[PDB]
């Protein structure tokens, strides 16, 4: 795995899935406006709330922090390849050929029903994100030993990571319970992936993806020591299955910490 994500590309990757059609927010049937009502109807329960919050493997994206920024000063974007987290200081910084998030951005406003601009939205989660560090969950200590992130976290934000750097469940298991240590008791985890997929492009590189199913997701969940809030499913759509990988569903799952 680590191997193969050496030919990682940030930019195949973005377009591969976060630019039309996957990435046109108009249709509200697509999975991103699917993933994004999910986590904001999540936050909108005010039942996940802090001061510092973890997004596990971040790759170069941030729209899984959209409705979460507003519920947390104190942000923490990881991930393992220098050249995402490159990516995410560029948007952050706002610096130049930044990826355009502002789709999502409008998207997570209108979703939220607040009627803030996005542009707000936007500069909330640029001023709460106060470092991107460096990260691998098939370490028992994903951040290490002495990271500037505060620990315990708050609450934990993963979208996509475990099943995409697992061989197999158990992989996916013991990397479980690696961030899980990362999560403050009683804290709360926001998990979104990939259901029955099995690999995806990210340029040259041809990642291998642990397929799973939603009861796999369930039962790993609470074998790490959590009780499952919500776990939902969202079918892939024949329009959305365009050769970048062959995904069959997308779940979501917000876990508490017992
Ligand atoms: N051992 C490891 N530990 C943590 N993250 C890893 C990892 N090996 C690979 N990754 C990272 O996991 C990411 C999977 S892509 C997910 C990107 C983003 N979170 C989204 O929702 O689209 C990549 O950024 C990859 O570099
Ligand atoms: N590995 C992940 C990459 C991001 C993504 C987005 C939408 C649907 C499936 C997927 C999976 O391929």
Request: aromatic letters at 8%; charged letters at 20%; proline letters at 7%.
């Amino acid at each position: 795995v680590a191997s193969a994500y050496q030919r990682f590309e940030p930019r195949a990757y973005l377009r591969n899935n976060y630019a039309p059609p996957r990435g046109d927010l108009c249709n509200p049937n697509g999975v991103g406006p699917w993933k994004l009502r999910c986590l904001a109807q999540t936050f909108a329960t005010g039942e996940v709330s802090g001061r510092t919050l973890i997004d596990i493997g971040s790759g170069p994206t941030v729209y899984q922090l959209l409705s979460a920024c507003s519920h947390f000063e104190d942000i923490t974007m990881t991930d393992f390849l220098e050249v995402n987290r490159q990516e995410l200081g560029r948007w952050l910084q706002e610096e130049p050929g930044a990826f355009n998030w502002s789709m999502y951005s409008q998207h997570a406003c209108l979703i939220e029903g607040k009627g803030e601009c996005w542009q707000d939205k936007e500069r909330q989660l640029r001023a709460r994100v106060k470092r991107v560090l460096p990260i691998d969950v098939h370490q028992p200590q994903p951040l290490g030993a002495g990271s500037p992130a505060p620990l315990p976290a708050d609450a934990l934000v993963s979208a996509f990571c475990l099943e995409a750097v697992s061989p197999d469940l158990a992989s996916f298991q013991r990397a479980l319970d690696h961030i899980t240590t990362l999560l403050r008791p009683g804290g709360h985890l926001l998990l979104i992936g990939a259901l029955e997929e099995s690999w995806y492009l990210a340029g040259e590189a041809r990642l291998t993806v642990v397929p799973v199913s939603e009861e796999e997701v369930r039962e790993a969940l609470v074998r790490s020591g959590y009780k499952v809030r919500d776990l939902r499913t969202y079918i892939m759509p024949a329009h959305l299955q365009t050769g970048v990988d062959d995904v069959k569903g997308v779940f979501f799952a917000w876990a508490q910490k017992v």
